Amino acid sequence: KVAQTRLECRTRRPNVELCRDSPQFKLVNEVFTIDDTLQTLKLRLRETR
């Protein structure tokens, strides 16, 4: 939720200031990694059940 709320507010930047920088890379990276984290956690939960 932190990642996606940071990502949404930073697309409303003004015209010349809409900049693909390294924070965009870190936010996309963190969204993908936390998705993979969540996935392996529910797989382990199913095995434990």
Binding site: A3, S22, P23, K26, E30, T37, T40, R44, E47, T48
Partner: protein, 49 residues
């Protein structure tokens, strides 16, 4: 005798399996928490720069 030995062996098989699963489950939790915290603070520092 085969029935008794099979029941006791099945109980101890379930023993070793669930014990190893519970022992392995905590390291995944700890590593995922550390990874999440470190990447979020990296995102914040990058935003500051």
């Amino acid at each position: 005798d085969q029935s008794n030995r099979l029941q006791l062996c099945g109980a101890e098989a379930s023993r070793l399996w669930a014990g190893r699963m519970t022992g392995d489950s905590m390291r995944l939790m700890q590593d995922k928490d550390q990874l999440t915290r470190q990447m979020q603070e990296g995102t914040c520092r990058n935003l500051g720069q």
